[PDB]
Structures are given as C-alpha cells and as structure tokens.
C-alpha cells in the first residue's frame, strides 16, 4: 500500500541525518530529530502559517527537502486516487474516506 | 449561556496552558459548563495571551476610522489588520467613535 513510501521517506532522512547533521561529534539523540520532522510534516499538513520554526541551521534545509517531497507525494497520490474515483477504480472501502479528507 | 466567570476563566487558562491549543475536546471535559466550540471561542477572544485588552490610542482610532469607510461590513476581516483581533472591541470602538462624534 502506502507503507513503502513511509518507510523509505523515514529511512532516507535517517541516512541523511546519520551522514550529515552532527558534522564531527553530535547526533543529538535520534527519535528527537525525527519527531521534529514529523511535527513539520503535520505543520505543512496544517494548510497554515503553522510552520516548523526555530530550528538548527542545515537541518532546516533537510527538513524542508523531505517535507516538500512528502507533500508532493501526498498531492500526487491523492490527485491520482481522485481521478481513479471518477470511474476507473469503481471501488473503495476506506479509499473514499481518505481521498475526501485529503481533497 | 456563556457567562464567562473568573473562576471558569482561570480554569480555561490552566487547561490551555496544560493540555494544549489544538485540542478543544480535551479542554471541554474539565469545565462542565461550556462546549468545545465555546471554549475555543473564549480562548481566541478573551483568554488569548496576545490580546491587547487595553491602551486604546489615537493611532489605532485613526486606523479604524480610515478602514470602516473602505469596508463597511466584514469587521472580522479588519480585526487582525487593525491589531485588536478580539472581533468585539472593534465594534465597541466604532460605536464609541460614532456616539462621541454625534453629541
């Protein structure tokens, strides 16, 4: 289903936050940076001027990068699902609810 | 209803400080007098920490006088633009400016 998108997007941020961020000897925990990222995903999901602010320097660009990509993912999958909702998919159990919410 | 007593206002401020801001159902389960929409409206009207409940000056009066003629209706649109953002102090200031200039 959609789970591979989630697993891929979290692990790629994990790989990038392993490689960069600390730049020497830092790596501020782990779940914490992913939690700030998840809150940022909800913040861009908020359709608002609610935005993840007051952060680190280059972690900001990484957060923005994966955020815009997950937003592109949501927009793409949702637009295709609504187009499939026209008369292509002919079928939904919970897909109807998910597409209505996202649209 | 909605008398907005002081002991209820302190409990609403403590619930907004403890539970959160985007959780209106969690704050309405500890007051037993108002609903969640009424509690959110009270928190956005009088219990907001950024609300300027005093210090009515001549610059804000000249800003509101130079805005009520450009837009006669939609006082809620000019609430955050004037700086009051209470959605009822603007109408009260307009009524005071209309009654004081009438004699």
């Amino acid at each position: 289903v959609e789970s591979h998108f989630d697993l891929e997007l979290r692990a790629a941020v994990m790989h990038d936050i392993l490689d960069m961020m600390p730049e020497g000897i830092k790596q501020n925990k782990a779940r914490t940076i992913l939690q700030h990222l998840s809150e940022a995903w909800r913040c861009w999901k908020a359709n608002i001027p609610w935005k993840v602010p007051g952060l680190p320097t280059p972690i900001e660009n990484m957060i923005l990068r994966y955020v815009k990509a997950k937003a592109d993912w949501w927009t793409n999958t949702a637009h295709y699902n609504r187009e499939r909702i026209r008369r292509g998919a002919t079928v939904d159990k919970t897909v109807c609810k998910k597409n209505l919410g996202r649209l | 209803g909605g008398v907005w007593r002081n002991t209820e206002d302190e409990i609403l401020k403590a619930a907004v400080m403890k539970y959160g801001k985007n959780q209106w159902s969690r704050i309405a389960s500890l007051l037993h007098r108002k609903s969640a929409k009424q509690c959110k409206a009270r928190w956005y009207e009088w219990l907001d920490p950024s609300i300027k409940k005093t210090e009515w000056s001549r610059e804000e009066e000249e800003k509101l006088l130079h805005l009520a003629k450009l837009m006669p209706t939609q006082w809620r649109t000019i609430a955050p633009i004037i700086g009051r953002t209470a959605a009822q102090c603007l109408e009260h200031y307009e009524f005071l400016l209309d009654k004081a200039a009438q004699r």
């Binding site: 961020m21 600390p22 730049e23 020497g24 830092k26 501020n28 925990k29 914490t32 940076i33 939690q35 700030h36 809150e39 909800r42 913040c43 609610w50 993840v52 007051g54 952060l55 680190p56 320097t57 972690i59 | 959160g20 801001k21 985007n22 959780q23 003629k69 450009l70 837009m71 006669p72 955050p80 633009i81």
Partner: peptide, 28 residues
C-alpha cells in the same frame, strides 16, 4: 549542532489602496 525541543503539535502589508479607491468611488 544541537537538536532543540519540538512541542507544537496538537497531542505582506495586508492592505491595498485599490480597495479604498473603489470604496470611495462607490460612496461618491
């Protein structure tokens, strides 16, 4: 390079002269 805390989740000029110029013209 330190991660700060993250607790936010629930768990231009804003004026144009054309609107005022339209409102004064409508009043006139």
């Amino acid at each position: 390079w330190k991660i700060p805390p993250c607790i936010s989740n629930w768990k231009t000029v804003h004026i144009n002269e054309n609107f005022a110029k339209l409102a004064e013209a409508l009043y006139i």
